[PDB]
Amino acid sequence: VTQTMKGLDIQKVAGTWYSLAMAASDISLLDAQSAPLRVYVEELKPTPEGDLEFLLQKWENGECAQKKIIAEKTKIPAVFKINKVLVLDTDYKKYLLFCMENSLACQCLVRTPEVDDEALEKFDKALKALPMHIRLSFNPTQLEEQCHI
Amino acid sequence: SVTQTMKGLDIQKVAGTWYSLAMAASDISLLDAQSAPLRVYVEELKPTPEGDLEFLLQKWENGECAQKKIIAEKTKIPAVFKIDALNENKVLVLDTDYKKYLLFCMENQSLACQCLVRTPEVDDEALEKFDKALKALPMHIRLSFNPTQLEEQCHI
Ligand SMILES: CCCCNc1ccc(C(=O)OCCN(C)C)cc1
């Protein structure tokens, strides 16, 4: 992943998000509820030091676990270290596109638990240069359920 | 569910070798596991003397790769077939050029579609036409397979 967001203002990504769609380089990264990169972003909280706190849900040992993880800033405003987190694009008010790279998985986040045509079209365009072998998308009912069940 | 069928399908010309390059389904659970209900790999098509279409496929069953044969019976629409199985179903051929790619769906309402290729290689045209076809359909999971997997039992 090289195409990261120019001019990111991380403070404007604060608040609630919903994982609408995800894609990964390897089927095993996303295929099961327990798959390693099957994670649902529920909130982003930029820190006073310019780090990025993720609140996510992840299926572990038969429960939907909530995790709070700090992604530490790097010299590239759009790149953090949790894996590298790369923010490809956001309009702050509607969508955010990011990837996790070690293996590669990318997500389309939306501000409201609804399908957004613009967000998904931009996600598809961003994935054209990336060697993805699994793509998932979630319905509005799933977005509001613990671990998108 | 599926609006697009192949006009003027000649089932004799779809006969022979195929490989499942990509698949997509309306419900993640139809395709997410090696054991998922619509996770099947088409290896060969055989038209019958009655104009039915026999699918020779691989399916993960009892933790091993099994060979299975499924007859999709002809209907009054050339590109639409029906498997004698408990559940109401349709097999729909969306598009083929016969010599490189074939796009089909299974409707059960559950829906899964596949991109078949003649040669066990990633084909840009096959995948681009598959993706265009899927824009019309409410898919929540898409898988694609590397050329090594195409020639392994059950795409392992
Ligand atoms: C650049 C403007 C940043 C303003 N911040 C926000 C603006 C909007 C939202 C938000 O969630 O809006 C959803 C409603 N649709 C119409 C936008 C969340 C944060």
From Swiss-Prot, chain B:
Subcellular location as annotated: Secreted
GO molecular function: identical protein binding; long-chain fatty acid binding; retinol binding
Processing and modification events after translation: Alternate disulfide bonds occur in equal amounts in all variants examined.
Protein name: Beta-lactoglobulin
Tissues where the protein occurs: Synthesized in mammary gland and secreted in milk.
Role summary: Primary component of whey, it binds retinol and is probably involved in the transport of that molecule.
CDD domains: lipocalin_beta-LG-like
Membrane-spanning intervals of the chain: none
Family: Belongs to the calycin superfamily. Lipocalin family.
Quaternary structure, from the entry: Under physiological conditions beta-lactoglobulin exists as an equilibrium mixture of monomeric and dimeric forms. Interaction with LMBR1L which mediates the endocytosis of LGB has been observed in PubMed:17991420, but not in PubMed:23964685.
Chief location of this protein within or outside the cell: secreted
The entry's keywords: Allergen, Disulfide bond, Milk protein, Retinol-binding, Secreted, Signal, Transport
